[PDB]
Design a protein around this ligand. Structure first.
Ligand SMILES: CCN[C@H]1CN(CCCOC)S(=O)(=O)c2sc(S(N)(=O)=O)cc21
Ligand SMILES: [Zn+2]
Length: 257
């Protein structure tokens, strides 16, 4: 089974999933000097005032927080999109030192971690049907750096010792995602895919320019988790990111001058 080690990491994935060498793969490096400003784009519209969270889980690859998507309650629209996209889950990727951790890079620079918020297009009915189409998903990414603490992240870090190993879950209600966003909403955008297998080419990426700050005691807690199951040898959950792939066919656009 796939993973991030010496014998089953990124350089091996193509043997079971051939699309790994396709024409619109992610992540990539963003060169700020080549990107072109586009004056016809529209501002982003984020409406999370009615969100209902349910549970938190460790899946062997990272940890995820889930929401109830049976009605329009937390949605994303505008920007380069046409239509309405509904929120289903969020997760993170990080490193073993403060100098590495993120998947996307800026003029060759790497940050300590990267946060991903996932949404699907309502015209298709539900989630499973949407991942099989070219314009099915929309993912919003935000960078993390080490400095002062972020108040709204604390409730997540205090529950981690109850889901240490693979297969564990716990109740997690009334959490508000508006507390993890920066001041400004200016961005970059291009067409791509998922960053872990099955690697399907169904995503419209939207990456924010301004990062958020967290303390060293907070990211320390992330590194104490495990990749293995209860009653098995200990392997620490660190360095779970895929590196930069070829641009080829595409061009990147910016909403700011
Ligand atoms: C471990 C498998 N992770 C996949 C599969 N997915 C199904 C998980 C059930 O949750 C609904 S997913 O479509 O949600 C999604 S989004 C991304 S990313 N890193 O944002 O590009 C990876 C994935
Ligand atoms: Zn991700």
């Amino acid at each position: 089974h796939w993973g991030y080690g010496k014998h089953n990491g990124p350089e091996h994935w193509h043997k079971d999933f051939p699309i790994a060498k396709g024409e619109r793969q992610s992540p990539v490096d963003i060169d700020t000097h080549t990107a072109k400003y586009d004056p016809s784009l529209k501002p982003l519209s984020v409406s999370y005032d009615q969100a209902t969270s349910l549970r938190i889980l460790n899946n062997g690859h990272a940890f995820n927080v889930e929401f109830d998507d049976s009605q329009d309650k937390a949605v994303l629209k505008g920007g380069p999109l046409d239509g309405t996209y509904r929120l289903i889950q969020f997760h993170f990727h990080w490193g073993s030192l403060d100098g590495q951790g993120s998947e996307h890079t800026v003029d060759k620079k790497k940050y300590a971690a990267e946060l991903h918020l996932v949404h699907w297009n309502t015209k298709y009915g539900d989630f499973g049907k949407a991942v099989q189409q070219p314009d099915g998903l929309a993912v919003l990414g935000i960078f993390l750096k080490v400095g002062s603490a972020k108040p709204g992240l604390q409730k997540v870090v205090d529950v981690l010792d109850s889901i240490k190993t693979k297969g564990k879950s716990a109740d997690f209600t009334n959490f508000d995602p508006r507390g993890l966003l920066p001041e400004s909403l200016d961005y970059w955008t291009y067409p791509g895919s998922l960053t872990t297998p099955p690697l399907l080419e169904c995503v419209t990426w939207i990456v924010l320019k301004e990062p958020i700050s967290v303390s060293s005691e907070q990211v320390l807690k992330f590194r104490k988790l495990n990749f293995n199951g209860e009653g098995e040898p200990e392997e620490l959950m660190v360095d779970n990111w895929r590196p930069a792939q070829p641009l080829k066919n595409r061009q990147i656009k910016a909403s700011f001058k």
